[PDB]
Amino acid sequence: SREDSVYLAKLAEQAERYEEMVDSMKAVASSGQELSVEERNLLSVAYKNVIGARRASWRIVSSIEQKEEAKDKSEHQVKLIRDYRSKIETELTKICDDILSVLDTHLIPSATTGESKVFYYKMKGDYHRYLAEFSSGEVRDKATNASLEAYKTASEIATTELPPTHPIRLGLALNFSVFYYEIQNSPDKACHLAKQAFDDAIAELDTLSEESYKDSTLIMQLLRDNLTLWTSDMS
Template sequence: MAAAPSPRKTYSYMAKLAWEAWRYEEMVEFMEEVSAAADSEELELTADKRKLLFDAHGNVIQARCDSLRIISSMEKDEESGGNEDHVAIIRDYLSRIESELSNICEGISKHLDLRLNHPASSAKGEIETCVAELKIDDQRKNTTLTDIAPSPPRKKYMYMAKLAQNARRYDDIVEFMEKVIDAAGSEELTFLERRLLSVAYEKVMTQKRYALTVVSCKDEGDEEESGGNEDRVAVIRDYRSKIENEISNFCDGILELLDSCLILYASSGEVKAFYIKMKGDFRKYLDDVKARA
């Protein structure tokens, strides 16, 4: 019987799957496991694993830097227009993204210090520059605004959802739109709220379905089985199952929202038809996943 693959090899392969499926957050997670699995006799990562580690962090860092640039530009526009309530909301959201970015930079910097026993001064320098820029942003963020009344929750979260849309942070849009729904209570959502809700869920679902398609092709195509890599086949199927569960839970969430309040509180046939179509779409996505299982 062949020996089981080492955790390092397993997580390295999972990181490659995540790369192909455009799931960069998970790629970071898996590559950190690769680094952590290095034993005391072999602390240095191989060249291909170092590349995976830096590619993983590079993608998640770049995405957040892009978001910061977009939202910071919106902050300047709102500031010049004297919209202090919007500026306050923007700064709250910037703080959230800055905190995420700072944690990521500190994480990769720690790997450079403790795990990677090779010349990496250039990469480490770029990370340290990123952290320094965040500290400068903290000074800007702490500038005081004139005392203003907080925005009503529904208005606040709708504006945050628009910020997230501009920054292409679709998971955040889903989160904020669910808070809009909570704040609306028994009131019907406006046209713009319905549209943003639908866009957010469809975008997130598209990303998950793409990932499932990529991983499923590796499984159903028998690429690894034909090469006798049974261990890798098991890894692929575990990862595929994880994505399928994500899709099922995501679909269950929006279907519950539609049934429990959105369709219930729809006051016109047009609005009800919008929600029923949305329900049909996500029911189909859910059925597709169950059919694959």
């Protein structure tokens, strides 16, 4: 049953068992049916948490790898770390390819609303960006261009279909600006986008209900936090 899968996804979230949460939402997402706002968020949280753990692991093992590289003798040791990092990289790829195939096959094609289109192309940008984070060469360049194209598509729809305060549109600007800064190494692009998104939203905040206001300003704070961070790095 479908409503049961959703309920179990919610249980799994509370239990912090995110791989199960993914299994349940993937099953739900893999019907013809468009997801509700709640189901979209459940899907997104599930995968965010599953990939997040691996990304966290990858960053740690990477740090260790280059610290052991810099005590040169090593070698058999560095090999063990390399292969371990590679194991984690395989997992990351698999997780990314999983949600990306769900987005390409089920979610993006069945999306009728502007909200849902922006949401899914944003997610597509995110998982290609995760792929770009640890890849090299042709593989990285392909993931980068795919990430950029999906974020651009999301942005074109958001720009025309969603108000500037919409949390989906703000969250897009947040992640897209992060893409620019971290993946493309493009600070001007990143700061311009984050600032424009913040500013555009600031204008219409006084038109929002309490709940909408809370949702928007939470993301707008993340935008300002990144802008704060980036402008101080560049100094």
